[PDB]
Design a protein around this ligand. Structure first.
Ligand SMILES: C[C@@H]1CC(=O)Nc2cccc(-c3cccc(OCc4ccccc4)c3)c2N1
Ligand code: NA
Ligand SMILES: [Zn+2]
Ligand SMILES: [Zn+2]
Ligand SMILES: [Zn+2]
Length: 226
């Protein structure tokens, strides 16, 4: 930013620690998350084959306590890294998975006013809904949220009912092997994209701060920097 906002460690600790404490308070649901994952002790020796960057409540607290975050979205990212690790490693029917989901529900209810007190639009990391996908074999056809579909290379998509590829009428089409696709479900949420305030440098969501009737020819400036 031009007049950059610098967060001092105590500012971040005092603002964000209540949201971490809200997770700690959940009993039984925080219990799997209060300490670093110890695969030999827990009997899950394949853990680090699947989880490459572990995260837990005690580590996040230590990072807040020692000023290891420069800005609060780094804290939000660590909280969701912790959650996403657990949703990846554990089965949907498992205790740890269900406890993770409770913690995420608590976090999402706590984080917005805290991030707003630090000058941000909100604290919400992910978009509200999966994006609607375009379906290749009809013109009209689209893949709604949570629908099943097939996909090659994350790009050419087909709804399973109508399941020779090209992305432009002038592009020579190629024959791809049906049985080289991957069946998927359209239930993934992407991170909400950001725009930086050109004065203070805070990352704000495009959807929160950019409006259909406003132009920013010299660059976005947030409400507090105006
Ligand atoms: C996050 C971490 C690692 C993980 O992804 N999966 C996992 C698998 C097996 C046990 C635990 C585990 C670790 C510590 C405590 C714990 O407690 C479970 C429990 C049992 C009974 C009451 C309350 C909590 C489970 C666990 N969790
Ligand atoms: Na899983
Ligand atoms: Zn926002
Ligand atoms: Zn279709
Ligand atoms: Zn600003």
């Amino acid at each position: 930013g031009s007049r950059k906002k610098i967060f001092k460690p105590e500012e971040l600790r005092q603002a964000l620690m209540p949201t971490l404490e809200a997770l700690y308070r959940q009993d039984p649901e925080s219990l799997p998350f209060r300490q670093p994952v110890d695969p030999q002790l827990l009997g899950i020796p394949d853990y680090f084959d699947i989880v490459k960057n572990p995260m837990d409540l005690s580590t996040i607290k230590r990072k807040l306590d020692t000023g290891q975050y420069q800005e609060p979205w780094q804290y939000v990212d660590d909280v969701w890294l912790m959650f996403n690790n657990a949703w990846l490693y554990n089965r949907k029917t498992s205790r740890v998975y269900k406890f993770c989901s409770k913690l995420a529900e608590v976090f999402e209810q706590e984080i917005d006013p805290v991030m707003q007190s630090l000058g941000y639009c909100c604290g919400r990391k992910y978009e509200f809904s999966p994006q609607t996908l375009c379906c290749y074999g009809k013109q009209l056809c689209t893949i709604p949220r949570d629908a099943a579909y097939y996909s090659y290379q994350n790009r050419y998509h087909f709804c399973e009912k109508c399941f020779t590829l090209g992305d432009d009428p002038s592009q020579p089409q190629t024959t791809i092997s049906k049985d080289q696709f991957e069946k998927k479900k359209n239930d993934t949420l992407d991170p909400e994209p950001f725009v930086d305030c050109k004065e203070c440098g805070r990352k704000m969501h495009q959807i929160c701060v950019l409006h259909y009737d406003i132009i920013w020819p010299s660059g976005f400036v947030c409400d507090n920097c105006l």
